[PDB]
Amino acid sequence: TTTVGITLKDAVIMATERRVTMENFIMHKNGKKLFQIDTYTGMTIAGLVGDAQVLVRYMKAELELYRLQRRVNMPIEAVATLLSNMLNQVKYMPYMVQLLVGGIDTAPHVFSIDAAGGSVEDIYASTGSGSPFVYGVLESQYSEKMTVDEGVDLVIRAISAAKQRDSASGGMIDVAVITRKDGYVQLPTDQIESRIRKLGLIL
Amino acid sequence: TTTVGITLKDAVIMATERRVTMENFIMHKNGKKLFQIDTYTGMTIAGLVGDAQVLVRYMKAELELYRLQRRVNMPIEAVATLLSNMLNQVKYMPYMVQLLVGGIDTAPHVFSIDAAGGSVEDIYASTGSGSPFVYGVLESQYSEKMTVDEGVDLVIRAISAAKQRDSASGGMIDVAVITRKDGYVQLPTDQIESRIRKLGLIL
Amino acid sequence: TTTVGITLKDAVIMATERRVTMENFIMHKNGKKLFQIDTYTGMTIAGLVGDAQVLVRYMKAELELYRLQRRVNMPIEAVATLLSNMLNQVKYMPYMVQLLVGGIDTAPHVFSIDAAGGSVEDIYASTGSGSPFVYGVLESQYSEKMTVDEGVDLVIRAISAAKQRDSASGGMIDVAVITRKDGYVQLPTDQIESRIRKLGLIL
Amino acid sequence: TTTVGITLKDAVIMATERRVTMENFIMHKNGKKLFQIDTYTGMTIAGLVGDAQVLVRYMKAELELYRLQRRVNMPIEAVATLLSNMLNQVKYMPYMVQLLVGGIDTAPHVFSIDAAGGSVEDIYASTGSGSPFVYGVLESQYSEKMTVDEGVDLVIRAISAAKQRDSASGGMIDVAVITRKDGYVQLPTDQIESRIRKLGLIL
Amino acid sequence: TVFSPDGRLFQVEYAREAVKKGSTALGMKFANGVLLISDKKVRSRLIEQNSIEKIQLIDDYVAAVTSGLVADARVLVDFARISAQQEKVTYGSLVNIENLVKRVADQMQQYTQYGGVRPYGVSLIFAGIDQIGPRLFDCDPAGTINEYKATAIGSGKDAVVSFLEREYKENLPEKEAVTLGIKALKSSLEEGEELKAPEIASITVGNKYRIYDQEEVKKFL
Amino acid sequence: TVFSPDGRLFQVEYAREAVKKGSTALGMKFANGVLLISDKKVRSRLIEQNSIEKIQLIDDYVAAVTSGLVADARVLVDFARISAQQEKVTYGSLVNIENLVKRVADQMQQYTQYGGVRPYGVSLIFAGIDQIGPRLFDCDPAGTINEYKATAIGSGKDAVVSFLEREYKENLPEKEAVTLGIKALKSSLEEGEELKAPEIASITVGNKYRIYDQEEVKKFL
Amino acid sequence: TVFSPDGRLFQVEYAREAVKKGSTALGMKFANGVLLISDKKVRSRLIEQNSIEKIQLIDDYVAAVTSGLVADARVLVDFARISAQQEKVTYGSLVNIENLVKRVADQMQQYTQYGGVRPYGVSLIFAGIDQIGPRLFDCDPAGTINEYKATAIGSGKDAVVSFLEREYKENLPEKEAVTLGIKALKSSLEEGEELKAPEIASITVGNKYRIYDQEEVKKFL
Amino acid sequence: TVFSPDGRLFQVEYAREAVKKGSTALGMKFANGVLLISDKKVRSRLIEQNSIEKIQLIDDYVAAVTSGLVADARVLVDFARISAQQEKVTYGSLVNIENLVKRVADQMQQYTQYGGVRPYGVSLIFAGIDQIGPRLFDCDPAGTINEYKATAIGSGKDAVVSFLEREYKENLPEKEAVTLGIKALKSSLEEGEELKAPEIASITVGNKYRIYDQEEVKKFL
Amino acid sequence: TVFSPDGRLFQVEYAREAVKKGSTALGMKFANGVLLISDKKVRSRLIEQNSIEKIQLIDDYVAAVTSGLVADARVLVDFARISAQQEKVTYGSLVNIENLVKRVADQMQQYTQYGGVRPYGVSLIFAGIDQIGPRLFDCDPAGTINEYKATAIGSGKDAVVSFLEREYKENLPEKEAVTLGIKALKSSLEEGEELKAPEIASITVGNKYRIYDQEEVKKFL
């Protein structure tokens, strides 16, 4: 399982593949690891499914409530922080999970969060089993001067690479791009596999 | 022990075998692993009996209460999520069990749940000691364009196979098919063994 | 220590031997392992004495109270279930015991209950140290077309065999047959030892 | 340490030796291991002194209180049951002890209770570091057709045997006989040592 | 709540008043089952009709109808509901319904003596078929429970109870039974002529509860 | 609940009134056992007859009958029931029945002094045979308990108590004992002529309780 | 809070009074959705206009409006909010809206009997579309709940309710529906002529709620 | 319970009233022990004689007799029983009896000031021989305790106490002591001539309590 | 605290009285910030001048001023203070100031219904700039909260509120806004001519709060 969030100009793109496995026993081919969490933000799950899912629900509801009560959306740094607090608070009986949360408020952001509530922002970050491989192609071809369209390709490549060197990753790679103009939008399956074909990639 | 849920067109089929053992000492030849849990939904138990049984009872009552109070049946993704929460909430002192819940609300569904509250939907999934062997024949011959009858056969064959390669599974295999039209219906013992015979299978 | 329950036509027969030991040091030659628990129901204890005993008392009273309050006897499946709930609810600090509860409500019944609340009904079942040996003879000569007399002998033979091959089992074997006509009746010592002799058995 | 209780016709005899040691360091030559617990009942302690003692005080008082309130003495099986419940109720942080309680209500009795609350009645039974030895001569010379006097001798013999082969047992052997006629009566030290002499025994 | 110099709990008495001011309902055992019937008196056109169900199921084999403080009634019903589930999950089957009602009754009885808390201003009747057979019980604010052959509650209790007291037919087959009932209900509250649209449901040994549809009831009306 | 200037608990007194307005019942030791009898005064045909059992079993060897606030009584009974089991499970045997009644007596006594709570408006008598022999005790709202040779409770207490007080025969054999009793019961409440159908049960040393069937009781009636 | 000799909880009655002195609002089902409309009566220029929102959202598919003690209404609203999230997080979906109102209702019913605590002097109505479809419920201080085809609350309840009671049109398409309502709202409280600025919001099956903008409402005004 | 403007707890006073209306009993130290005696006044033939024991044992070497509200007395006695056991199990021996009474006294004293709870309406006297020698103490509802050479309690307190106050003989040997006692008791309550059957028990240093048998008591009678 | 027959909480009303008897203060939104102004009326020369600060900071970007029972006011403020910190520590920033005030209000509303406790006899106003912009809220003892363009509180509320109600200039720049303010404050309480020394503080979007020094305020004075 590999996911990645990347920041650029006036957008943030998040993508993951979706193979859920039990050791070597790949039991589920189409899991879901990318979730819209708020009008202008998404989250990627990686780690132990149970812990991940309930955490997504909490976050989701917690956000919606805040919105209503404050009449405004919660800032990304704020959501990251809340999540940081929740995780660390129970560090000694932790939600074995690795979260990546991205979104755009006044500007784009993407924070990497660990099971002990350690929270840090970067311009792009990968999470999960295939992390290294992607971190390689990213360290290699990522440029802040890229277009939202160039990005989606990069991302797709990056993951397709990790899909090659990591048995724990696989299945249809899917991406969502969130911008202030159109909000959080998840690209259409066909369009994605199309770029795959176009890029000469596989699976 | 082996169970299997499968999805197709406008129905879902679930079946299991029924041998209950203590290591190699096969102590009970006719246990029950298939349970109807609501008018349009069923559940398969796999793992430690004590934990499994109590979970089936809780599930049973909880849904019935709900039906009465909400005047409508609880959706499949809902029961699964409910179950998910229950299990995860106590992951540190888990119900050693592996559940498969299928049913049909607006459409057929079947979810795989693990002892930590990890829940995931697929088009078919097997559970228990003989899962692999069935995942094989299923992966080999399952087609979503199958008829409710072709399915019931497929399942019987799959389970039979596992019965061949797994000493933990055994006994009379039994299936229940659930459709919106007739609801949850458990096939008559003779009709099953009949199919066994016709299929040239054994036991 | 060995106990056995056997179901037939319109009755349930239950028997156990009665040697209580501490490893090899056989300390008590006459313990009791068969107990009537209600007008039409009995139970066989096997495992840790302390736990077993207190478990029998709770069961005893709980049933009596139920009878008075509901004006009817608790159904066998019901008592099994209660026991199940009780046991499982404390799985992590279990009553190290193995119970067999037989009786006759609308029809005969016999349930095998484990220290984890696993409860399953069979047409006959053995419990205890020598279970294997008796499972052997039973598997060999039991027939649901037997008369309650043939049964009482079968049971005596079974336990007798076990006594041969298991140093943990011993002492005077004693049986109780329960029927709707006469209720729970425990056979007189002499009658039991008489059949032993006639059969050419021993001890 | 070795204690023994024996049943015969219309009386119950109990006796123990009285050496309290700390491994090989025999530190207390005259401990007390026989206690009258009620007008017509006694108890023999064996195990960890501290636990034993507190257990004797509880039992003592609990008994006296019951007499006063119920205007009748507590039956032997009752006091046994009581003890049983107490001990098992704390099996996981047990009173490391082995108690023998005998007495005579409508008839004589003698129960063996273990640290897990397992209670069983026999016609005679020994407890302690030297149990086996006594169980030997007892198994050899005990006869229910004996007289209270023959008994007292038997007991002394037994304990004297155990004292020979078990370094943990030792010191003056003392006995108390309890009958309905005279109640619980502890035999005079002299009368005991005299019998020893007469029997050609030692210590 | 305390005793009057005449040995009475005035608060519980007053609570009874509130139930008298409630709608009228009744039930009776018949051939091989039991049936319930409540007068569904409606006002405005703006009310969502059926939604004002007076007869509520506790489980497929047991229903109850209530009269008195509506809020109180509801909470009381739900208590019965989870209580029903409780027994099932522990014993694996609700063997004797009489026990279910006893438990909800004790609940009520508690507020009859535990100081600081107002008594449940409601009475209700349970009916359905259990391990023993068709059963019918009623329960007042005091926690008093009784089993009947037939009975009623609410406003027109006295009236309707008498009619039955005189014209109740032992093992009346369902169709006639529901008739005798609707007639009895009628006579009672029918000082105001129009019976309106009564709410009726019934069950018979061997199967689950059946609620009568608008047309079917209109047939007996 | 507090002391009046004359040293009395008015609330407890008022409670007593309620029990007076309850049904009449009695019990008495005889030959080698003891019997209990209560006047089952029924109203409508619509009541489920026997279901209104006044004599209740606490255990095969001990029963009790009550008079006063029906609700309070039931709950008090059930308490006595579980309380009985308790002794059995811990000691392995209910050796002295007096204790059981004592424990239920104390429950009541508590409400006699613990501030914010109304006293149990009910009195009952327990009878049965224990380790000592046949036993008969009565208990009031105050938690006062006494052992009798014979006694009654409820409405016609004074009347029937007197009858016995005069014509009670010591070791009267069962058949006549029940006779003297029913006669005594009759006299008392029988200002209204018809004794109706009495509820009677009896146990004798050596075995379990026996409840009299409709015909058998009608034989003495 | 206790029962009056006539079977009434005076406190709850008094509470109702407080609600009558509250702003007027209403709601009604229409074509394929439901709408809410409250009379936003403003005083000083110094008030921050819109900030005094009477129609509040519980969740994108369910809103509710309230009348009575403002503080009590708010706290109650928030309760409904978190309670909504609860169902969403456990079941994964708020399937039946009727349940949400039921929960808040019971919250309120508790203060009707648990001694030391003043009842919630506020009534409110919930409206939105759930799994069943468009739904409309009202709730009083007594915890009483009912589903409607259309209804109102606050000061001009009686008035406006009658207007609808007469001129309510079953499946009225949004535009006309909002018209019939504003007219109805008008007639009622409009003893004082000026309707001022009404607050209105509507949702239809298939999508999220929509709040009407100042101009859009002024169009119907 | 609070202070009157003259510094008195009226409730404790009223409680005392209740003990005055109780039976009459006494006890006195004599030769080498102490003896207790109470007037066993019986009514009906129907009472189970001896069962109405007034002198109760706390432990073989200590007994107490009580007067006042029967129930309270009972509960207070059991308390003293377990409390006696407590000292035995912790220290291994009830060295000073004075301490036992002090604890139960304190138990009573708590109700004298702890708000919402009625005072124990009973007075009792403890007698027995402890490590110090033969001892005699009395205790009232106020928790006041004192040690006597002889004293009485209950109804005829004032009378019987005066008799002793005048004719009490210091080291009177048992036989004469019990006589002096029974004489004193007689005179007192004996405004009604018949002394009936008194209940008497005595213990002497060195051994356990001895309860007199019907004939033995009838010998001094 | 309970409802009067006309639906009012007399205790909360009375509380309001206590705040009317407090000092006068006000605030209003202006150009691109908001200001707070309170009449600092002093008595003895012996007071430590400035130490009697009426305008208090909750955080560098939000202050509040209060009126009514001083003790209540203080405790309520500290609550707001820690409450503020709380949001910062969990979310990392106080995004919406409206929320802060809601919390402190809810704290007040609880004492409006939770039995045994006296409501907070104080009202206060919160002002500062948050994520939305410059904001102004007032809060009364009932827990009622609203946002204003401008408003006052304390003794001269009605007076100063009217003056603004009439002469309030929408986007008035600071210097003139404070002027209009001090003018309005004057008129009101200035039945006693001398305005004494007003306490004034203001903040503008983009930065932290600024408290006016003695001379700066004296300049507008």
Closest to H69 measured CA to CA, from F140, F138, F104: F140
- HSE at residue D76, side-chain half, CA atoms within 13 A, is 24
Tokens of B26: 């096969």
Closest to D100 measured CA to CA, from D138, D62, D131: D131
Closest to C43 measured CA to CA, from C5, C91, C84, C17: C5
Rounded CA-CA distance E180/E200 in Å is 13
Type and span of the H or E element at E66: strand E62-68
Question: Is it the case that chain G and chain E have 3 or more CB pairs lying under 8 Å apart?
Answer: yes
Rounded CA-CA distance D102/D7 in Å is 9
E46 in Cβ contact with G150 (< 8 Å): yes
Chain F segment 76-115 residues within 8 A of C by beta carbon are 78, 81-82, 85, 88-89, 92
Best probe of the G interface among A35, A36, A64, by most G CBs < 10 A, is A64
D12 in Cβ contact with D6 (< 8 Å): yes
Domain count, chain A: 1
| Residue D186: φ, ψ to 5° | -95, 130
DSSP 8-state code for residue I50:
G
- Written as one letter, the residue type at G163 is F
Count of C-beta atoms within a 10 Å radius of residue E217: 19
G90 in Cβ contact with B88 (< 8 Å): no
E127 in Cβ contact with E62 (< 8 Å): yes
Chain F segment 118-137 residues within 8 A of D by beta carbon are 131-132
Residues near A145 by beta carbon (within 8 Å), at least 6 away in sequence: A9
F154 in Cβ contact with F23 (< 8 Å): yes
Cβ separation H21–F7 shorter than 8 A: yes
Three-state secondary structure readout of A109-170: EEEEECCCCCEEECCEEEEECCHHHHHHHHHHHCCCCCCHHHHHHHHHHHHHHHHHHCCCCC
**In whole angstroms, how large is the CA radius of gyration of chain G?**
17
Type and span of the H or E element at F72: helix F70-91
- HSE at residue G142, side-chain half, CA atoms within 13 A, is 20
Q: Judge whether B68 is closer than 8 Å to chain E, CB to CB.
A: yes
Count of C-beta atoms within a 10 Å radius of residue F34: 26
- The minimal CB distance from C92 to the residues B30, B49, B93 is found for B93
Distance of CA G157 to the CA centre of its chain: 11
- HSE at residue C114, side-chain half, CA atoms within 13 A, is 15
G58 in Cβ contact with G100 (< 8 Å): yes
- Written as one letter, the residue type at A53 is Q
Rounded CA-CA distance A80/A76 in Å is 6
Q: Is the dihedral of CA F87, F88, F91, F93 positive or negative?
A: positive
- Written as one letter, the residue type at I71 is A
Tokens of B149: 């009858």
* Helix, strand, coil % over all residues of chain D, rounded to 5: 35, 30, 35
Type and span of the H or E element at F153: strand F150-153
Closest to F180 measured CA to CA, from F197, F192, F163, F196: F163
Type and span of the H or E element at H105: helix H97-113
Q: Judge whether B65 is closer than 8 Å to chain E, CB to CB.
A: yes
- The minimal CB distance from A72 to the residues I90, I92, I96 is found for I96
* Strand boundaries in B23-173, DSSP class E: 25-28, 34-38, 41-44, 99-104, 108-113, 119-121, 124-127
- Written as one letter, the residue type at I143 is G
> What dihedral angle (degrees, nearest 10) is formed by the CA atoms of D37, D38, D39, D40?
-80
Instruction: Work out the widest C-alpha separation in chain F, in whole angstroms.
Output: 54
Count of C-beta atoms within a 10 Å radius of residue A184: 22
Rounded CA-CA distance D188/D183 in Å is 15
Which residues on G lie below 8 Å from E20 (Cβ)?
Answer: 7
Type and span of the H or E element at F136: strand F134-139
Question: Is it the case that chain D and chain I have 3 or more CB pairs lying under 8 Å apart?
Answer: no
A167: alpha, beta or left? (left if phi > 0; alpha if psi -120 to 50): alpha
Q: Is the dihedral of CA A78, A79, A85, A91 positive or negative?
A: negative
Rounded CA-CA distance A163/A48 in Å is 19
SS3 D194: helix
Tokens of H87: 């000292």
Rounded CA-CA distance H160/H167 in Å is 10
Rounded CA-CA distance C135/C4 in Å is 9
Rounded CA-CA distance E119/C68 in Å is 29
DSSP 8-state code for residue I168:
-
A87: alpha, beta or left? (left if phi > 0; alpha if psi -120 to 50): alpha
- Written as one letter, the residue type at A158 is A
Q: Judge whether A90 is closer than 8 Å to chain B, CB to CB.
A: no
Residue I151's alpha-carbon distances to G45, I22, I104, I166, in angstroms, are 10, 16, 19, 12
Rounded CA-CA distance H46/F164 in Å is 8
Q: Is the dihedral of CA A17, A23, A26, A32 positive or negative?
A: negative
Rounded CA-CA distance C173/C186 in Å is 12
Strand B11-16 and strand B20-22: pairing? unpaired
Rounded CA-CA distance C177/F201 in Å is 32
Three-state secondary structure readout of D35-103: EEEECCEEEECCECHHHHHHHHHHHHHHHHHHHHHHCCCCCHHHHHHHHHHHHHCCCCCCCCECEEEEE
E147 in Cβ contact with E137 (< 8 Å): yes
Chain position carrying tokens 């660990």:
A114
Closest to G149 measured CA to CA, from G41, G40, G28: G28
E128 in Cβ contact with E156 (< 8 Å): no
- What is the resolution of the experimental data for this entry, in Å? 3.4
Q: Residue B58: exposed, middle, or buried by beta-carbon count in 10 A (0-12, 13-18, 19+)? A: middle
Cβ separation C69–F78 shorter than 8 A: yes
H97: alpha, beta or left? (left if phi > 0; alpha if psi -120 to 50): alpha
Specify which residues D176 forms β-bridges with: D14, D186
Rounded CA-CA distance H68/H12 in Å is 13
Residue C165's alpha-carbon distances to C1, C130, C197, D56, H10, in angstroms, are 12, 8, 19, 42, 82
Type and span of the H or E element at C63: helix C49-70
Type and span of the H or E element at I219: helix I214-220
A81 in Cβ contact with I90 (< 8 Å): yes
* Helix, strand, coil % over all residues of chain C, rounded to 5: 35, 30, 35
Rounded CA-CA distance H53/H62 in Å is 15
Residue G68's alpha-carbon distances to G58, G109, I113, in angstroms, are 18, 16, 15
DSSP 8-state code for residue B32:
-
Rounded CA-CA distance I171/I153 in Å is 22
Which residues on D lie below 8 Å from H57 (Cβ)?
Answer: 68
H194 in Cβ contact with H161 (< 8 Å): no
Closest to B69 measured CA to CA, from E78, E21, E98: E78
Residues near D113 by beta carbon (within 8 Å), at least 6 away in sequence: D80, D83, D84, D87, D98, D99, D100, D101, D119
DSSP 8-state code for residue D32:
-
* Helix C49-70 × helix C76-88 angle, to 10°: 130
Rounded CA-CA distance H48/F127 in Å is 13
E179: alpha, beta or left? (left if phi > 0; alpha if psi -120 to 50): alpha
Rounded CA-CA distance B20/B12 in Å is 25
| CATH code of the domain containing B63 | 3.60.20.10
- Written as one letter, the residue type at E110 is Q
- Written as one letter, the residue type at A106 is T
A1 in Cβ contact with A130 (< 8 Å): yes
Rounded CA-CA distance B185/B168 in Å is 27
Rounded CA-CA distance D173/D163 in Å is 9
Boundaries of domain holding B157: 1-203
Rounded CA-CA distance B46/B127 in Å is 7
- Written as one letter, the residue type at H181 is G
Return the ∠ at Cα D67 (arms to D62 and D68), rounded to 5°: 100
Question: Is it the case that chain E and chain B have 3 or more CB pairs lying under 8 Å apart?
Answer: yes
Chain G interface residues facing chain I, Cβ-Cβ under 8 Å?
Answer: 10-11, 14-21, 44-48, 51-52, 69-72, 74-75, 111, 116-121
SS3 G186: helix
Closest to A192 measured CA to CA, from A146, A147, A160, A145: A160
Chain position carrying tokens 């009223």:
H14
Rounded CA-CA distance A99/A103 in Å is 13
H182 in Cβ contact with H36 (< 8 Å): no
Type and span of the H or E element at D12: strand D11-16
Domains (range + CATH), chain H? 1-221 (3.60.20.10)
Chain position carrying tokens 């899909």:
A163
A137 in Cβ contact with A153 (< 8 Å): no
DSSP 8-state code for residue H31:
T
Tokens of G170: 């079953």
Specify which residues C18 forms β-bridges with: none
I63 in Cβ contact with I201 (< 8 Å): yes
Specify which residues H58 forms β-bridges with: none
Residues near H119 by beta carbon (within 8 Å), at least 6 away in sequence: F3, F113, H1, H11, H12, H15, H108, H111, H112, H141
Cβ separation F95–D72 shorter than 8 A: yes
Q: Is the dihedral of CA H156, H157, H158, H163 positive or negative?
A: positive
Q: N- to C-terminal Cα distance for chain G?
A: 44
Rounded CA-CA distance C200/C183 in Å is 30
Specify which residues C25 forms β-bridges with: C22
- Does A147 qualify as catalytic in the annotation? no
I160 in Cβ contact with I184 (< 8 Å): yes
**In whole angstroms, how large is the CA radius of gyration of chain C?**
16
